[PDB]
Amino acid sequence: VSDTRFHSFSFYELKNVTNNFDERPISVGGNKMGEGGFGVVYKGYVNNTTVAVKKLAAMVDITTEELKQQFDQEIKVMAKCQHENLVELLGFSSDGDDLCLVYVYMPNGSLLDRLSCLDGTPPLSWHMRCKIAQGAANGINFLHENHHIHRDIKSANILLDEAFTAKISDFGLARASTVMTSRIVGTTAYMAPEALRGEITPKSDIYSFGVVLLEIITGLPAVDEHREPQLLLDIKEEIEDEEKTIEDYIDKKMNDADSTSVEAMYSVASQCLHEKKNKRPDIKKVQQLLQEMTA
Ligand SMILES: Cc1cnc2c(NC(=O)c3cn4cc([C@]56CO[C@](C)(C5)C6)nc4nc3OC(C)C)cnn2c1
């Protein structure tokens, strides 16, 4: 028998509670909160509950069959994986014109957006950042403990709930768990070199998480075409080659950071970013180092 499943929404009900998928920003009165390579995310309100509705689409010139596959994968993964640091799927729509996925609304959006204080939100404190780093590592640990590879760890896919708890999202490319694939996927600025060459391994998640930790420490996005260096991961080299120090790069929009715990987190990041996959820590070691950082 099929057992537990997710609620099915009417496409028309989702259309209805997102104001017909209004792509205007929330401040303008619309419903668009964000977008990615595979969909646009709309704020909705169903059953006296604020929700996030992701309406899938080919925004990076993917095929329709591949998108349907990713839709199916995320439902499969979300059915098996429930944890305090993973987002929760409320339901889906597949009857109407487009595929939709419905999630618990995350009042503080994505880590990427909060690090960029997008829309005027106040900067995250060091204390909040440490909790976020710890929570995301607990979420990755749950995934890896349950033999899942995320393949797209990045600060846009770490969402922040009503308590600024980190919630990992977007499991459409997740893989069961070393093998080599012909379809290279992910976000270039976060990807381990072996992932960039087609290898599939949880060690690649660890590298990408190290980039996220650099974003947390510095407030800088992983890539910025108008910045020198354009890739954040290249600051590790400038620090190691003593052109710079980690203090030179610490986010200045923070009044409560202290050198010891920042250097402790940078140490974890540096260990995750070892470009030899076999030299990186596993997630359980990352978790432990991060717990000791605020001990
Ligand atoms: C796979 C997947 C994708 N996305 C999601 C989401 N998203 C959201 O709930 C979400 C919520 N907010 C709230 C705000 C703000 C704007 O001004 C403020 C004061 C309110 C912050 N901005 C958001 N942005 C959101 O999403 C975007 C990052 C795409 C939930 N689950 N989920 C699962």
UniProtKB/Swiss-Prot annotation:
Organism expressing this protein natively: Homo sapiens (Human)
GO cellular component terms listed in the entry, alphabetical order: cell surface; cytoplasm; cytosol; endosome membrane; extracellular space; extrinsic component of plasma membrane; nucleus; plasma membrane
Protein name: Interleukin-1 receptor-associated kinase 4
Reaction(s) catalysed by this chain's protein: L-seryl-[protein] + ATP = O-phospho-L-seryl-[protein] + ADP + H(+); L-threonyl-[protein] + ATP = O-phospho-L-threonyl-[protein] + ADP + H(+)
Cytoplasm recorded as keyword: yes
Main location: cytoplasm
Cofactor(s) needed for function: Mg(2+)
Keywords from the UniProt entry: Acetylation, ATP-binding, Cytoplasm, Disease variant, Immunity, Innate immunity, Kinase, Magnesium, Nucleotide-binding, Phosphoprotein, Serine/threonine-protein kinase, Transferase
Positions carrying Phosphoserine: S182
Domain annotation Protein kinase: ranges: 27-290
Subunit structure, as described in the record: Associates with MYD88 and IRAK2 to form a ternary complex called the Myddosome. Once phosphorylated, IRAK4 dissociates from the receptor complex and then associates with the TNF receptor-associated factor 6 (TRAF6), IRAK1, and PELI1; this intermediate complex is required for subsequent NF-kappa-B activation. Direct binding of SMAD6 to PELI1 prevents complex formation and hence negatively regulates IL1R-TLR signaling and eventually NF-kappa-B-mediated gene expression. Interacts with IL1RL1. Interacts (when phosphorylated) with IRAK1. May interact (when phosphorylated) with IRAK3.
Parent-protein start and end of this portion: 160 to 459 of 460
Keyword field contains Kinase: yes
Similarity section: Belongs to the protein kinase superfamily. TKL Ser/Thr protein kinase family. Pelle subfamily.
